[PDB]
Here is the input.
Amino acid sequence: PFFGLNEKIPVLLAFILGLQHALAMLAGVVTPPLIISSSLSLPSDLQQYLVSTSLIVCGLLSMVQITSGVLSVMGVSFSIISVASGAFNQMYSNGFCQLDEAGNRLPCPEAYGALIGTSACCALVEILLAFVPPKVIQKIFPPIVTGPTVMLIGISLIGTGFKDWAGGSACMDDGMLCPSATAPRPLPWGSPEFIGLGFLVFVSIILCERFGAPIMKSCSVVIGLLVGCIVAAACGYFSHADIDAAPAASFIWVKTFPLSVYGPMVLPIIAVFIICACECIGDVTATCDVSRLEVRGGTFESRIQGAVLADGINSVVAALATMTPMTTFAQNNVVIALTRCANRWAGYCCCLILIVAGIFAKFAAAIVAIPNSVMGGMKTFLFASVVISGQAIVAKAPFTRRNRFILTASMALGYGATLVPTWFGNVFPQTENRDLEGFENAIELVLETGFAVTAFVAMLLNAIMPAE
Amino acid sequence: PFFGLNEKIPVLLAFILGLQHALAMLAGVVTPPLIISSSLSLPSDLQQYLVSTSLIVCGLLSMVQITRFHIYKTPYYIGSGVLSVMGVSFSIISVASGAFNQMYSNGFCQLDEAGNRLPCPEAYGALIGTSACCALVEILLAFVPPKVIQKIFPPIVTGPTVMLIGISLIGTGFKDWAGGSACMDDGMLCPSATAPRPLPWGSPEFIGLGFLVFVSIILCERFGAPIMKSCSVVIGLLVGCIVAAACGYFSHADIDAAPAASFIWVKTFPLSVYGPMVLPIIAVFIICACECIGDVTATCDVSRLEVRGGTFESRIQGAVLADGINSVVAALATMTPMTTFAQNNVVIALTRCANRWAGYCCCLILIVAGIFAKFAAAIVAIPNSVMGGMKTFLFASVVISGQAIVAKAPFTRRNRFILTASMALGYGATLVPTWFGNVFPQTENRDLEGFENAIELVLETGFAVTAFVAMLLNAIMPAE
Ligand SMILES: CCCCCCCCCCCCO[C@@H]1O[C@H](CO)[C@@H](O[C@H]2O[C@H](CO)[C@@H](O)[C@H](O)[C@H]2O)[C@H](O)[C@H]1O
Ligand SMILES: CCCCCCCCCCCCO[C@@H]1O[C@H](CO)[C@@H](O[C@H]2O[C@H](CO)[C@@H](O)[C@H](O)[C@H]2O)[C@H](O)[C@H]1O
Ligand SMILES: O=c1[nH]c(=O)c2nc[nH]c2[nH]1
Ligand SMILES: O=c1[nH]c(=O)c2nc[nH]c2[nH]1
Here is the structure.
C-alpha cells in the first residue's frame, strides 16, 4: 500500500519510519565530522560537540526542505572532506597552522573557521546560481562528466576508511585502553585485531543485507557498524572514561569558531556547491519517481528550484550553526520505495529524532568513542558504495570509444593529480613571495584536489572531442 | 568498401594495415615482459631478449589462431578463422607480483638486504613451468562450454575483477611515470633521482616526460586520422620518448651493445620447475578463456559475421583452443600465458577490413621486428617516465573497460551492493602484505605450510578475491 505525500498515517508508523530514516542517514551525517576532526584536532570535547551539533542542525534543515515539498532529507556532504584534505595540508604547510615531532599536527580551529567563513560565503554563490537553470546544468554536467568526478571522489576518500580500518591514521596512544599498535606517525599500520574488527563490520553489513527485512534497509551500514561495535565492546575496545566525562546536553553553539575568517579555498568551495546543486537535482527527481509524482512538470521544476534554494540557504544556516556545507541524502529514496511511503511525517519524525539524539549528547560521545576500526570498516563500505554509485552515474552515457577514452583520461589524470604532493617550479620554486604566490597556493589547492582535476579533464575532452 | 575475411586486397593495403595492427598491439605485447623482468632481474641481455622473443612468439601464435588449417581434420577445430590477434596477458603480472614477492620472502630466491633484489631466473622458470602446465588445464576445459561460461562469469562478476586487475596493476604505471620503481643509479645517464629503495620518488622532469606522453596520446586522438587509431598510445609513447631523447634521456651505449639478431631460444629458462601459484595460473587462464570469448564475439560483430550460429561457437571453440595451445607453445618458448588482444576490433571497425592478410602482414611485421633485436633494445632504452605515462594510460583503459563490462547488468540495489562489497574487499585484500596468524603465526613448518603459502598467494591477489566475493554474493543474494 503506497502512501502519498500529504496524508496522515498512524503516528506510530510515522515515528518508526522516522526512526528508519534517522538510522539510515545516521552514518552519513555522523562520519564527516569524525573525518574532519581527526584530520585537524584531537579534543574529544569538540568531536562530541560536532557530532551532536550535526545531528541537531541536520534535523532542523531537513525540516526546512521537507516543507521542496516531498521527503527531502538533508545532511552533511562528503565533497567538502576531499576539498578540506588539500586545504588543511596546505594550511599546515605554507599556511598558519603548526606542527610537532615530525608527524603530529597541532589542532588548528582557525582553519575550520576559515572553512566555515568561505563555505558560508560561497553557499550564496550557489543560491544565486540556483535560480532558473534546470536542464541547462544537466547539459553542462552530463553523466560523462558527472560519473567520473563522483567515482574519483569516493575513491580518493576510501583511503581514510581503509586507514582507520587498519587502526590509523594515528595508532592508539599511551594508557589508552587496548593499544595493539602504539606509535607516532604510522598512518596505515595496525595489528590483525583491527583488520578483524573492520572486516566484522563489513561482513555484518553483508549479512544485514542477506537476511534483510524492509526495516533493515539502508541501515545495513549502520547495523553492521553497530554489530561490530558490540563485538568491539565485548573484546574490550572502549573508553567509558571519556563517555562518562562527556556532557549530557548540547545547544547549537556550545562551542564556537572564528568569523571574518576565510581561506583561498574559495573556488573549491564553489565547486563543492555546484556538485551539491547537481546532486540535489538528481536526488529530488529520484524521490519524485519514488514518490509516484511528476517528473517533468512545471510543479516538478518548482520543487527542484525550492530544493536547491533551501539547499544553499541551509548551507549558510549550517555554517552559522558551525556546520560545513550540506546536501541531499539519497539513502531515503530506497527506504521510501521499499516501504511505500513518502509522507512528510516520516521525514519530520526523522528530523525530531535526530535533533533529540543530538541533545542527548551522550549518543554523540558514544559515537566518538567508537574504535577507529569499526568506523574503518563501516566507512570503507560507505565510500566504496560512493564509488559504485558514481559508476552507475557513468553508465547512463552510451559507452562509445569516445566516452571510454574521455573516462580513461579523466580518471587517470585526476587520480594522478591526487598522487602528487605539491607543485613549485614556476612562481614558487625558489620559495618566492608575491601577491600572486598566495593564490598560486589556491591553484595548488585546486590542482591537489583529485575530482576537480577529473571534472576539468572530462569537461575539456567532451568539449574538444568529435561526435562519434 | 567493407572488406571481408577472404578477399585479396592490395598487398600494399594488406601490408599497411598489417603495420597499423602491428603498432597497435606492439605496446600491449612488449609491456608485460618489461614489467615481469624489471620486477625480478637487471641484465639488459634478458630484457632485450624477452622483448624480441615476445615479438616473435606472439607473431607466430597469432598466425596460429588466425587460421583453422592447422588442426581441423574431422571433429571441432583449432583455432579461429577470422582476425584473432594474440599477445601476452596482463593477468600474469598481477599474479606474478604476489608470486615473486612470496618467492623472495619464503621461497628460494635471494636478496642481500641492501638495494635491489638479486636476479632470480629460476622463479621465471617456475612461472613458465606452472603456466605451461595449466594452459592444459584451460584447453581441456575449453571444449564445448560456450554460453555456460557466460552464465558462470556474468557482467556482475566479470566487470569488477577486470576493474581491479587494472587498478592494482596501474600502480607500476604511475611508479614508472615518477621514475621508479627504482630511481636511476650512479654513472648512468641523466640521473635526476638516485637512490636505493625509493619506489615512488622522482623529480619534476619525470612527471613532465610521462605527462608529455599522456598529453601526446590525447593530442593524438584530438588530431587523429584512421591510421593513428589504437596507435595513439604508441604514438604518444613515441613522442614523449623522442622528447626524452631530446632532453638527453637515452643510453646509446647499451643500444649499441645489443645484438641485431634474435632466435626463439637465444636465452633459456629452467624446466621441470613449478611454483605453488598453480591455482592463480588456472585463474589467469579462466580469465583468458572468457577474454577470448568476449574479444572474439566482438570481432565477429565488427567483421559482420554470425553472432549465434553453430559456426560462430565453433569459431569460439577454436579461439580458446588455440589460446591455450599457444599458451603452452609460448611457454616452451620461455613466454608467459597469452590471450586475445582486443584493440584490433576498433581498427577493423574503423578501417572496414577484416581480411586475414592484414593479420598475416601484421604477424610477419612483428616477427621481423623481433629478429632485428636493436628495436627491442631501443624499447628497453625508453626512460621509465615515458613508459610510465604510456603504461598508465594502458591500465587506466583496462579499468574503464572492466567498468563497461560491469554496466551490462541492470544497476539494482542488489548489483550495486555486490559491486561495492566486491570492489572494496578485493582492493582491501590488495592493501595487506601477508597473513600468518593461523598455521604460520609462530613461523611453523608442516606439510601444509608450503601451500598455506599458496593460499597466501591467491589471498594477496586482488582480483581473485574481488571475484570470489562477487560470485559468492551474486549466488547467495536474492533476486531483486
Ligand atoms: C576545477 C573545476 C571544478 C569543477 C567542479 C564542478 C563539479 C561538478 C560535478 C558534478 C557533480 C556530480 O553530481 C552528481 O549529480 C548526479 C545527477 O546528475 C547525482 O545523482 C546520481 O546519483 C544518485 C545516487 O545518489 C541518483 O539518485 C541519481 O539518479 C544519479 O543521477 C549524483 O549523486 C551527484 O554526485
Ligand atoms: C580465487 C578464484 C579464482 C577464479 C578466477 C576467475 C577469474 C575470471 C574472471 C573473468 C575474466 C574477465 O573476462 C572478461 O570477459 C569479457 C567478456 O565477458 C571480455 O570482454 C569484455 O571486454 C572486451 C574488451 O576488451 C570487449 O571486447 C567485450 O565485449 C567485453 O565483454 C574481457 O575482455 C575479459 O576481461
Ligand atoms: O550518505 C550520504 N548520502 C548522500 O547522498 C550524500 N551526499 C553527500 N554526502 C552524502 N552522504
Ligand atoms: O593490449 C592488450 N590488450 C588486451 O586486451 C590484453 N589482454 C591481455 N593482455 C592484453 N594486452
About this structure: Strands of chain B lie at 86-88, 338-340.
